[PDB]
Amino acid sequence: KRVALVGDASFYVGPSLARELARREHNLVLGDPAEGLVDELTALGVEVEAVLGVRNLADPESAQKLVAAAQERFGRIDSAAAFSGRVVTGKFLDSTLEDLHSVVQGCLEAPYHFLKAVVPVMVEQGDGQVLVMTSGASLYSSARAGATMMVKNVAAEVARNGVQVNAVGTNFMDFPEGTVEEFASFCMPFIDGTSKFTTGQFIAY
Amino acid sequence: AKRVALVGDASFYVGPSLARELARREHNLVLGDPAEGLVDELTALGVEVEAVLGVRNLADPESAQKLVAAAQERFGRIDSAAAFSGRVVTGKFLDSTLEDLHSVVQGCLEAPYHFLKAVVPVMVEQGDGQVLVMTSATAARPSRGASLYSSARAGATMMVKNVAAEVARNGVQVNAVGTNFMDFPEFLRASGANDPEIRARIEAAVPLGRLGTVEEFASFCMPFIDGTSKFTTGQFIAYAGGW
């Protein structure tokens, strides 16, 4: 019955979210799923909408496309999760303007466009749960802080409409080689409908 | 005057007063776009002054280098540098535009980056130097009315904090002063604060106040750039970083 939208189920972090959500009886709108997921899930009894070519949320069009798709197929968006990241490291004095532009695009523009597209739908619905997943590194640390602010401020604004907005951090990519399945299970409280009163938080797995 | 102090913008009233204080404290000066009467007023007290033209838009990648370059050619040294960064855009998130997110990022994030990227490497090669980032007014904790600006302003705080940490070892101290309770007009000019409907919207989301004159504010800034106090770094005072 409930509809869950996951921006990226290509690669590995997103698929596990889809599995835990499917167990919790949530129909799915998946962005660029890896093959054998649409099929696996449809067999498990959950309806699935594939939205293609929407991995770069910086593209104003991408998030718009994911939402349009969810609205046409299911007519509702109860949960939405999106991973926002661009990897840029280096001491400050060694960075480039391009590096700053890249972190802003990934950790500020990609969430911005996501929220600006999903939240209107949930505002009209009077309910909704949003989850922004964020990924020494002066510029990167800086964008995360902004994305953290962004999430807290937007939450304060749209709580009046019954919509939750929270953010989660992950240690993966510091070791590209616990599991993701445990991380998905941990994400579920923000998107499965069980807890609806937490908002504007940043938690670290 | 033997020490060199660089002032990113001396066009209005705050920077002139900084330069005037610094000159009493025997600094030579690198000024971006000095106010009318300033260069002459200053040379008549015996200071050397390098006026750098058309640089007071610091989000312009070329503006900071021009200032640093003039200093290197005319003085060979930059002991202190001060510069103000910040553009405020108000409005609810749902009614916003990427254009507004760009405006805040360029003013609050790119502008400090260019200044630090050009002045700090010099101070590193020198093993000594004091930086002062004067920050736009911090917004309120549940920053409704200014979601995007607060996001950029947070990101800029984190950036300056990180930089202060990196270069502390190389003898370069970097500090932030907030301008929330120092509401001289030039600070909010770029943010459209002429028409008082805009200004009312700014005031709704950021606490403002003016506690003193610009001459007093110069005096107040000297501890971070006048060379007499060289052990503090990474400080965010007067709400530059939050509450």
Coordinates of C-alpha atoms in Angstrom, one line a residue:
Chain A
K1 CA 0.0 0.0 0.0
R2 CA 2.6 2.6 1.1
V3 CA 4.9 3.9 -1.7
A4 CA 8.7 4.1 -1.3
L5 CA 10.9 6.0 -3.8
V6 CA 14.7 5.1 -3.9
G7 CA 16.8 7.3 -6.2
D8 CA 19.6 4.9 -6.8
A9 CA 19.3 1.1 -6.6
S10 CA 22.1 0.6 -9.1
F11 CA 25.2 -0.7 -7.5
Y12 CA 24.7 -1.9 -3.8
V13 CA 23.5 0.5 -1.1
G14 CA 20.0 1.1 -2.6
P15 CA 19.0 -2.5 -3.4
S16 CA 19.1 -3.5 0.3
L17 CA 16.8 -0.6 1.2
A18 CA 14.4 -1.9 -1.4
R19 CA 14.5 -5.4 0.2
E20 CA 13.8 -4.2 3.7
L21 CA 11.0 -1.9 2.4
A22 CA 9.5 -4.7 0.4
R23 CA 9.4 -6.9 3.5
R24 CA 7.5 -4.1 5.2
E25 CA 4.9 -4.2 2.4
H26 CA 5.9 -1.0 0.5
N27 CA 5.4 -0.7 -3.2
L28 CA 8.5 0.7 -4.9
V29 CA 9.7 3.4 -7.3
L30 CA 13.4 2.6 -8.0
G31 CA 15.9 4.7 -9.9
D32 CA 18.0 2.7 -12.5
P33 CA 17.7 -0.7 -10.7
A34 CA 20.3 -3.4 -11.5
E35 CA 18.7 -6.2 -13.4
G36 CA 17.3 -9.1 -11.3
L37 CA 16.0 -6.6 -8.7
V38 CA 12.8 -5.6 -10.5
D39 CA 12.3 -9.2 -11.3
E40 CA 13.2 -10.4 -7.8
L41 CA 10.9 -8.0 -6.1
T42 CA 7.9 -8.4 -8.4
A43 CA 8.0 -12.1 -7.5
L44 CA 8.0 -11.2 -3.7
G45 CA 4.5 -9.6 -4.3
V46 CA 5.5 -5.8 -4.5
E47 CA 4.7 -3.6 -7.5
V48 CA 7.7 -1.8 -9.0
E49 CA 8.2 1.2 -11.3
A50 CA 11.6 1.5 -13.1
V51 CA 12.7 5.1 -13.7
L52 CA 15.7 5.2 -16.0
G53 CA 18.6 7.6 -16.3
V54 CA 18.1 9.6 -13.1
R55 CA 21.3 8.9 -11.1
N56 CA 22.6 12.5 -11.2
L57 CA 20.2 14.4 -8.9
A58 CA 22.1 17.6 -9.7
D59 CA 20.3 17.3 -13.1
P60 CA 17.1 19.4 -12.2
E61 CA 15.3 16.9 -14.5
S62 CA 16.3 13.7 -12.7
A63 CA 14.4 14.1 -9.4
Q64 CA 11.5 15.6 -11.4
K65 CA 11.5 12.5 -13.5
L66 CA 11.5 10.1 -10.5
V67 CA 8.6 12.0 -8.9
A68 CA 6.5 12.3 -12.1
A69 CA 6.9 8.5 -12.5
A70 CA 5.9 7.7 -8.9
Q71 CA 2.8 10.0 -9.3
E72 CA 1.6 8.4 -12.5
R73 CA 2.0 4.7 -11.5
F74 CA 1.0 4.8 -7.8
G75 CA -0.3 8.3 -7.1
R76 CA 1.3 8.5 -3.7
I77 CA 4.9 9.0 -2.3
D78 CA 5.1 8.1 1.4
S79 CA 8.9 7.5 1.7
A80 CA 11.8 8.9 -0.3
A81 CA 15.5 8.1 0.1
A82 CA 18.4 9.4 -1.9
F83 CA 22.2 9.1 -1.7
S84 CA 24.0 12.4 -2.2
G85 CA 27.7 12.3 -2.8
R86 CA 30.8 13.5 -4.7
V87 CA 34.2 12.3 -3.5
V88 CA 36.7 15.2 -3.2
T89 CA 39.7 15.0 -0.9
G90 CA 42.8 17.1 -0.4
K91 CA 44.0 19.8 1.9
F92 CA 42.3 23.2 1.3
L93 CA 45.4 24.9 -0.2
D94 CA 45.7 22.1 -2.7
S95 CA 42.0 22.1 -3.9
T96 CA 40.6 23.8 -7.0
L97 CA 37.5 25.9 -7.7
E98 CA 36.3 22.9 -9.7
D99 CA 36.6 20.8 -6.6
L100 CA 34.4 23.3 -4.7
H101 CA 32.0 23.3 -7.6
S102 CA 31.9 19.6 -7.5
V103 CA 31.2 19.3 -3.7
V104 CA 28.5 22.0 -3.9
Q105 CA 26.8 20.2 -6.8
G106 CA 26.8 16.8 -5.1
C107 CA 26.2 17.7 -1.4
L108 CA 24.1 20.9 -2.0
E109 CA 22.5 20.9 -5.4
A110 CA 21.6 17.2 -5.6
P111 CA 19.7 17.2 -2.2
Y112 CA 18.2 20.6 -3.0
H113 CA 16.6 19.4 -6.3
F114 CA 15.5 16.1 -4.5
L115 CA 13.7 18.0 -1.7
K116 CA 12.3 20.6 -4.1
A117 CA 10.6 17.8 -6.1
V118 CA 9.5 15.3 -3.5
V119 CA 8.4 17.6 -0.7
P120 CA 5.6 19.4 -2.7
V121 CA 3.9 16.0 -3.3
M122 CA 4.0 15.1 0.4
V123 CA 2.8 18.7 1.4
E124 CA -0.3 18.2 -0.8
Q125 CA -0.7 14.7 1.0
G126 CA -0.3 16.0 4.6
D127 CA 2.2 13.2 5.2
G128 CA 5.6 12.1 4.0
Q129 CA 9.0 10.8 5.2
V130 CA 12.2 12.0 3.5
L131 CA 15.8 10.5 4.1
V132 CA 18.9 12.2 2.7
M133 CA 21.9 9.9 2.9
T134 CA 25.2 11.8 2.8
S135 CA 28.6 10.2 2.1
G136 CA 41.8 15.8 5.3
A137 CA 38.7 16.9 3.3
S138 CA 38.1 20.6 4.0
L139 CA 35.7 21.3 1.1
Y140 CA 33.8 18.0 1.5
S141 CA 33.3 18.5 5.3
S142 CA 32.1 22.0 4.5
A143 CA 29.3 20.8 2.0
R144 CA 28.1 18.2 4.5
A145 CA 27.6 20.9 7.1
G146 CA 25.5 22.8 4.7
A147 CA 23.5 19.7 3.7
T148 CA 23.1 19.1 7.4
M149 CA 21.7 22.7 7.9
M150 CA 19.6 22.3 4.8
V151 CA 17.9 19.3 6.2
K152 CA 17.3 20.8 9.7
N153 CA 15.9 24.1 8.3
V154 CA 13.6 22.4 5.7
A155 CA 12.3 20.1 8.4
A156 CA 11.4 23.1 10.5
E157 CA 9.6 24.7 7.6
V158 CA 7.6 21.6 6.4
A159 CA 6.7 19.9 9.7
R160 CA 3.6 22.1 9.6
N161 CA 2.6 20.0 6.6
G162 CA 3.2 16.6 8.3
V163 CA 6.4 15.8 6.3
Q164 CA 9.6 14.4 8.0
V165 CA 13.1 15.2 6.7
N166 CA 16.1 13.5 8.3
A167 CA 19.7 12.7 7.2
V168 CA 22.1 9.7 7.8
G169 CA 25.9 9.3 7.4
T170 CA 27.8 6.1 6.3
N171 CA 31.5 5.0 6.7
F172 CA 31.5 3.0 3.4
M173 CA 33.8 4.4 0.6
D174 CA 36.4 4.8 3.4
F175 CA 36.7 1.0 2.8
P176 CA 35.7 0.1 -0.8
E177 CA 36.1 -3.7 -1.0
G178 CA 28.9 -4.5 9.7
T179 CA 27.1 -4.9 6.4
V180 CA 24.9 -2.8 4.2
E181 CA 21.9 -5.0 5.1
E182 CA 22.2 -3.9 8.7
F183 CA 22.6 -0.2 7.6
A184 CA 19.3 -0.5 5.6
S185 CA 17.5 -2.1 8.5
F186 CA 18.8 0.8 10.6
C187 CA 17.4 3.3 8.0
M188 CA 13.9 1.8 8.1
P189 CA 12.6 3.9 11.1
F190 CA 12.9 7.0 9.0
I191 CA 11.0 5.6 6.0
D192 CA 8.8 2.6 6.9
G193 CA 6.0 4.5 8.7
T194 CA 6.7 3.1 12.2
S195 CA 8.1 6.3 13.7
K196 CA 6.7 9.7 12.4
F197 CA 7.9 12.3 15.0
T198 CA 11.6 12.5 14.4
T199 CA 12.6 15.3 12.0
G200 CA 15.6 17.4 11.0
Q201 CA 18.1 15.0 12.5
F202 CA 21.6 14.0 11.4
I203 CA 22.6 10.5 12.6
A204 CA 25.9 8.7 12.0
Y205 CA 25.8 4.9 11.5
Chain B
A1 CA 55.2 51.7 9.1
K2 CA 56.9 48.3 8.3
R3 CA 54.1 45.7 8.7
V4 CA 51.7 45.1 5.8
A5 CA 47.9 44.9 6.2
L6 CA 45.7 44.1 3.3
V7 CA 42.0 45.3 3.3
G8 CA 39.9 43.6 0.6
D9 CA 37.4 46.5 0.3
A10 CA 38.0 50.1 1.5
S11 CA 35.2 51.6 -0.7
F12 CA 32.7 52.4 2.2
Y13 CA 33.2 53.1 5.9
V14 CA 34.3 50.0 7.8
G15 CA 37.4 49.3 5.8
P16 CA 38.6 52.9 5.7
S17 CA 38.4 52.9 9.6
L18 CA 40.3 49.6 9.7
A19 CA 43.1 51.1 7.5
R20 CA 43.1 54.3 9.6
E21 CA 43.6 52.3 12.9
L22 CA 46.2 50.1 11.2
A23 CA 48.2 53.2 10.1
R24 CA 48.3 54.5 13.6
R25 CA 49.7 51.1 14.5
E26 CA 52.5 51.5 12.0
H27 CA 51.3 49.3 9.1
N28 CA 51.7 50.0 5.4
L29 CA 48.5 49.2 3.5
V30 CA 47.1 47.3 0.5
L31 CA 43.6 48.7 -0.2
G32 CA 41.0 47.5 -2.7
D33 CA 39.1 50.4 -4.1
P34 CA 39.8 53.0 -1.4
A35 CA 37.2 55.6 -0.4
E36 CA 37.4 59.2 -1.5
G37 CA 40.1 61.0 0.4
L38 CA 41.6 57.9 2.0
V39 CA 44.8 57.4 0.1
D40 CA 45.7 61.1 0.5
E41 CA 44.5 61.3 4.1
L42 CA 46.7 58.3 4.9
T43 CA 49.9 59.3 3.0
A44 CA 49.7 62.7 4.8
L45 CA 50.4 60.7 8.0
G46 CA 53.4 59.0 6.3
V47 CA 52.1 55.6 5.4
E48 CA 52.8 53.8 2.2
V49 CA 49.5 52.6 0.4
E50 CA 49.0 50.4 -2.7
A51 CA 45.5 51.0 -4.1
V52 CA 44.2 48.0 -6.1
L53 CA 41.3 48.8 -8.4
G54 CA 38.1 47.0 -9.1
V55 CA 38.5 44.1 -6.7
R56 CA 35.8 44.5 -4.1
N57 CA 33.8 41.7 -5.6
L58 CA 35.6 38.8 -4.0
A59 CA 33.5 36.1 -5.6
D60 CA 35.3 37.2 -8.8
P61 CA 38.2 34.6 -9.0
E62 CA 40.6 37.3 -10.2
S63 CA 40.0 39.9 -7.5
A64 CA 41.9 38.3 -4.7
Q65 CA 45.0 37.6 -6.7
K66 CA 45.2 41.2 -8.0
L67 CA 45.3 42.4 -4.3
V68 CA 47.9 39.8 -3.3
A69 CA 50.0 40.4 -6.4
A70 CA 50.1 44.2 -5.8
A71 CA 51.2 43.5 -2.3
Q72 CA 54.0 41.2 -3.4
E73 CA 55.3 43.7 -6.1
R74 CA 55.2 46.8 -3.8
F75 CA 55.9 45.3 -0.4
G76 CA 56.9 41.7 -0.7
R77 CA 55.0 40.9 2.4
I78 CA 51.4 40.5 3.7
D79 CA 51.3 40.3 7.5
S80 CA 47.5 40.7 8.0
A81 CA 44.6 40.5 5.7
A82 CA 40.9 41.2 6.4
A83 CA 37.9 40.6 4.1
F84 CA 34.1 40.4 4.5
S85 CA 32.0 37.7 2.8
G86 CA 28.3 37.2 2.6
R87 CA 25.1 37.5 0.6
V88 CA 21.6 36.9 2.2
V89 CA 18.6 35.5 0.3
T90 CA 15.4 35.2 2.2
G91 CA 12.3 33.1 1.4
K92 CA 10.8 29.7 2.2
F93 CA 12.5 26.6 0.7
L94 CA 9.5 25.5 -1.3
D95 CA 9.4 28.9 -3.0
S96 CA 13.1 29.0 -3.7
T97 CA 15.2 28.7 -6.9
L98 CA 18.7 27.2 -7.7
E99 CA 19.5 30.8 -8.7
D100 CA 19.1 31.7 -5.0
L101 CA 21.2 28.7 -3.9
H102 CA 23.9 29.9 -6.3
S103 CA 23.8 33.4 -5.0
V104 CA 24.3 32.3 -1.4
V105 CA 27.1 29.8 -2.3
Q106 CA 29.0 32.3 -4.4
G107 CA 28.9 35.0 -1.8
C108 CA 29.3 33.0 1.4
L109 CA 31.5 30.1 0.2
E110 CA 33.4 31.0 -3.0
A111 CA 34.3 34.5 -1.9
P112 CA 36.1 33.3 1.3
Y113 CA 37.7 30.5 -0.6
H114 CA 39.3 32.8 -3.1
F115 CA 40.6 35.2 -0.4
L116 CA 42.1 32.4 1.7
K117 CA 43.5 30.6 -1.4
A118 CA 45.4 33.7 -2.4
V119 CA 46.6 35.2 1.0
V120 CA 47.3 32.1 3.1
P121 CA 49.9 30.5 0.7
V122 CA 51.9 33.7 1.0
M123 CA 51.7 33.7 4.8
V124 CA 52.8 30.0 4.7
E125 CA 55.9 30.9 2.6
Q126 CA 56.5 33.6 5.3
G127 CA 55.8 31.3 8.3
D128 CA 53.8 34.2 9.9
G129 CA 50.4 35.9 9.3
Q130 CA 47.0 36.9 10.6
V131 CA 43.8 36.3 8.5
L132 CA 40.4 37.9 9.5
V133 CA 37.2 36.6 7.7
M134 CA 34.4 39.0 8.6
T135 CA 31.2 36.9 8.2
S136 CA 27.6 37.8 7.2
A137 CA 25.0 37.8 9.9
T138 CA 24.3 34.3 11.1
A139 CA 20.6 33.4 10.9
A140 CA 18.5 31.9 13.7
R141 CA 18.7 28.3 14.9
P142 CA 15.4 27.1 13.4
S143 CA 16.4 29.2 10.3
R144 CA 12.9 29.4 8.7
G145 CA 12.9 32.1 6.1
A146 CA 16.6 31.6 5.2
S147 CA 17.1 27.8 4.8
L148 CA 19.6 28.1 1.9
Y149 CA 21.5 31.1 3.2
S150 CA 22.0 29.3 6.5
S151 CA 23.2 26.1 4.7
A152 CA 25.8 28.1 2.8
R153 CA 26.7 30.1 5.9
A154 CA 27.2 26.8 7.9
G155 CA 29.3 25.4 5.1
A156 CA 31.5 28.5 5.1
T157 CA 31.9 28.3 8.9
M158 CA 33.2 24.7 8.6
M159 CA 35.5 25.7 5.7
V160 CA 37.1 28.5 7.7
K161 CA 37.4 26.3 10.8
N162 CA 39.2 23.6 8.7
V163 CA 41.6 26.1 7.1
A164 CA 42.5 27.6 10.5
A165 CA 43.3 24.1 11.6
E166 CA 45.5 23.2 8.6
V167 CA 47.7 26.2 8.7
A168 CA 48.0 26.7 12.5
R169 CA 51.3 24.7 12.4
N170 CA 52.7 27.0 9.7
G171 CA 52.4 30.0 11.9
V172 CA 49.3 31.4 10.2
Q173 CA 46.3 32.2 12.4
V174 CA 42.8 32.6 10.9
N175 CA 39.7 34.0 12.6
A176 CA 36.1 34.9 12.0
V177 CA 34.1 37.9 13.2
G178 CA 30.3 38.0 13.0
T179 CA 28.4 41.0 11.8
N180 CA 24.9 40.3 13.2
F181 CA 25.4 42.9 16.0
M182 CA 27.5 45.1 13.7
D183 CA 24.8 46.2 11.2
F184 CA 26.7 48.8 9.3
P185 CA 25.0 49.2 6.0
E186 CA 27.7 48.0 3.6
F187 CA 27.4 44.5 5.1
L188 CA 23.9 43.9 3.7
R189 CA 24.1 46.1 0.6
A190 CA 24.7 43.3 -1.8
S191 CA 21.7 41.5 -0.3
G192 CA 19.3 44.2 -1.6
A193 CA 18.8 45.8 1.8
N194 CA 17.9 49.2 0.2
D195 CA 14.2 48.6 -0.2
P196 CA 12.9 48.1 3.4
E197 CA 10.6 45.3 2.5
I198 CA 13.7 43.1 1.7
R199 CA 15.3 44.5 4.9
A200 CA 12.2 43.6 7.0
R201 CA 12.4 40.1 5.5
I202 CA 16.2 39.9 6.4
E203 CA 15.5 41.1 9.9
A204 CA 12.7 38.5 10.3
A205 CA 15.2 35.6 9.8
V206 CA 18.5 37.0 11.2
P207 CA 18.9 39.0 14.4
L208 CA 20.5 42.4 13.7
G209 CA 21.7 45.2 15.9
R210 CA 24.4 47.9 15.9
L211 CA 26.4 48.1 19.1
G212 CA 28.9 50.8 18.2
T213 CA 30.5 53.1 15.5
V214 CA 32.7 51.8 12.7
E215 CA 35.8 53.4 14.5
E216 CA 34.9 51.3 17.5
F217 CA 34.6 48.2 15.3
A218 CA 38.1 48.9 13.9
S219 CA 39.5 49.0 17.4
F220 CA 37.6 45.8 18.1
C221 CA 39.2 44.1 15.2
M222 CA 42.8 45.0 15.8
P223 CA 43.5 42.0 18.2
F224 CA 43.1 39.6 15.2
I225 CA 45.3 41.5 12.7
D226 CA 47.6 44.1 14.4
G227 CA 50.3 41.6 15.3
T228 CA 50.3 42.2 19.1
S229 CA 48.4 38.9 19.8
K230 CA 49.7 35.8 17.9
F231 CA 48.5 32.7 19.8
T232 CA 44.7 32.6 19.0
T233 CA 43.5 30.7 15.9
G234 CA 40.3 29.2 14.7
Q235 CA 38.1 31.5 16.8
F236 CA 34.5 32.3 15.7
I237 CA 33.5 35.4 17.6
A238 CA 30.4 37.6 17.6
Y239 CA 28.3 34.7 16.3
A240 CA 30.3 34.1 13.1
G241 CA 29.6 30.4 13.8
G242 CA 26.3 30.1 15.5
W243 CA 24.7 30.5 19.0

